[PDB]
Design a protein around this ligand. Sequence first.
Ligand SMILES: *[C@@H]1O[C@H](CO)[C@@H](O[C@@H]2O[C@H](CO)[C@@H](O)[C@H](O)[C@H]2NC(C)=O)[C@H](O)[C@H]1NC(C)=O
Lengths: 248, 597
Amino acid sequence: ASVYAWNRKRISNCVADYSVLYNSASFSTFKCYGVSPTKLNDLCFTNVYADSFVIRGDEVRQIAPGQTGKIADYNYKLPDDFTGCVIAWNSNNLDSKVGGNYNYLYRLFRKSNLKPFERDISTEIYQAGSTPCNGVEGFNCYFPLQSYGFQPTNGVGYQPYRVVVLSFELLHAPATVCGPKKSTNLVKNKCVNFNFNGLTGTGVLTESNKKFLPFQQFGRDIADTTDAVRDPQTLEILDITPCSFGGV
Amino acid sequence: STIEEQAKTFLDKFNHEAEDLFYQSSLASWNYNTNITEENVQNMNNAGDKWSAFLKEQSTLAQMYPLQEIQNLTVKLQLQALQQNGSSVLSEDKSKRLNTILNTMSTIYSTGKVCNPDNPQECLLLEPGLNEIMANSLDYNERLWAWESWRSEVGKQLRPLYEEYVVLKNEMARANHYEDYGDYWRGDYEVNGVDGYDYSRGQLIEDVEHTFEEIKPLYEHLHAYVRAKLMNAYPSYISPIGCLPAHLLGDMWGRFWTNLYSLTVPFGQKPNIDVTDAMVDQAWDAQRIFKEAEKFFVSVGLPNMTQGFWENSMLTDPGNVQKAVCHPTAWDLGKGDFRILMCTKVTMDDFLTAHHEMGHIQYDMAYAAQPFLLRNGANEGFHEAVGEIMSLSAATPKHLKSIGLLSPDFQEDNETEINFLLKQALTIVGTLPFTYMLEKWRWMVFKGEIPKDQWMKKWWEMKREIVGVVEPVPHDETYCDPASLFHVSNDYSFIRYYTRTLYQFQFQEALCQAAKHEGPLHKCDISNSTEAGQKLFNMLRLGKSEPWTLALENVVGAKNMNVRPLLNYFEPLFTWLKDQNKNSFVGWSTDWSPYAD
Ligand SMILES: *[C@@H]1O[C@H](CO)[C@@H](O[C@@H]2O[C@H](CO)[C@@H](O)[C@H](O)[C@H]2NC(C)=O)[C@H](O)[C@H]1NC(C)=O
């Protein structure tokens, strides 16, 4: 969609794999504000707002925290305390066509600057002077939107550029967006330090004979000591025995 | 509220609108040129009319926004360029009369035909008939007959048309607070409001006069040697002391003396600089030409060029289903659209012409970030110079050897260098006095100082004193030979060629200095030189926002016009001409004429 009508998507209750986009190596711009891309991968966020639109290359700098401009102030404004990142890539092969891809628009004219994280889709003719527009364009009255001009021959500052802004959120609401929790291989019959979804126990894991219930996750003993855990991956039960120890 | 902010917002929005509409108009022109069809011509005409109407409306709407209280230099320059209404400064009737006169003059020049007296039914036009005859046939009688017929069938018709066109141009120039149309044209080079770079219209005139004065000995020696070779070819047609014939200059108006290189070659046995044999043996084509040119672009530091041009623009003649213009054109369409339209063949000449055209195109992307009103050169002699410096550098034997066109076993002796220098002088140096005199003549013709009843009597006089060329047939005021030229017959400034030549010589010298070149300037090649490309792009990207004097200072360090690069380039040729002309008369005599014995 147009930048003044930026597509807002709510990302939550899902695993957000930032590694694939961090290492796809095909995007012109990847700017992370407030947190490095690697560290946010192993971090949990309550929500993500994904604002996707198309702007020009020169306007790419406009889409950044603490920036002012036509796109920054009349189409999409970012708060200074930005948490997510911004990913932009050339769309000349897609969003640029022979004759001019004029479908896209941007709010060139507006009566006031946009509030951060606000979208303006007003189509009323902006009144430059004191002369009323009377519902039509003319003197002191112009359309608030200018059509984007995209052609395959355009330069870096004039080619189409799809921009996706991933703002991260973590607040009193329960955290939803987390990266892929890395899982290592499985070992057995060896005193190892394990962690199954937060158990963080240490011992020797052996093949179990007891049968859990499908809703159940891990067993327990009379002394309230963990003694059997079901694998979060392939469904099987393992008895955890304490590491061999004694006196000498 | 205030004029400043409202004018700036209007400037931005109508700059976007004008960029879009100019792109549409140039796209219609490109469609017409690639395929000459009735729908294509109609699209061309409609797009041109819409663009002109919207440009006039935007110019008027900017006119009601005063520039008195606007202090932004770029905004002021853009709005002043818009305010240059030109022919519309007069009444609607006067503008329509001027348009009709210009159209009639252009149509007469283009459709002008010459018919042999023996065969009245057989008639030939100027192009390609007259040009081919005058560049190939060496017969004095046939060349003189073609000269007289072309300058009579068109000159007599165009004389009233040219006179009324000049009168109208003076009228609008006076309505534009200019002394004459020459002043209006020179106002493009004028710089105002810039500290340390202001340029006046008379400054250009005096600089051109001084440059021609310091070039005079070299041109005199070159003309003397060409004349001597001409008696060597025409013993009984040209006096050793008298001036050269007008029709024996190679072309119709004497613009190019390259056609005389066959008869004025320093050595007709030594081979010339040409790699077309190896070029066609290497299975090269137009695609190979363009790829090698792009490789040369990226070799000098210039960035890789967009694939949109490759997937949009045409290279060779698109068969016979549709007709494409073979004239080399570099279309800076707009909205970042850049295309090239030429009939590219497997030849060295087409190689150099294509190199020139992608030089134009790269200069077009150079000022892409500038606004539409600033999306052009500072003057009319920059883009052609930018293309020609690259074309000449690629024409050097070093570039051909690097790209495989010339074998490394090739020997570079003084004979080939002298032949190439003389060929360039006939192509380049020969046209400088002619361009200078023609532009000056048009300047006082617009000024009206020279009485009309002896205008021709003035022209041939300056054909003798300046060019050193005497007409073979005397022409009265009925003849309008200067208007027989395409530029005069189509409202084109002619000083652009001389200015572009001097600019390109300066640019070549600057690029050679940046490339740490050692030796003759003609063998200098900017290939594989990042510093030269960067220095060129320092002025390429500036566009027309900065004064042209600022660009010249950035490139070569000379604020005003310079001829030192020309002297450095042609010093071997100057020495050779001085050595060869020691046994022949130097200069020319105005009194002698072919029609007087
Ligand atoms: C996690 O995903 C893997 C996908 O491979 C699932 O493991 C597969 O389970 C089948 C069951 O027969 C085996 O044949 C494959 O060899 C397993 N692949 C592996 C271990 O890489 C596993 O079931 C999933 N865990 C769940 C759903 O809890």
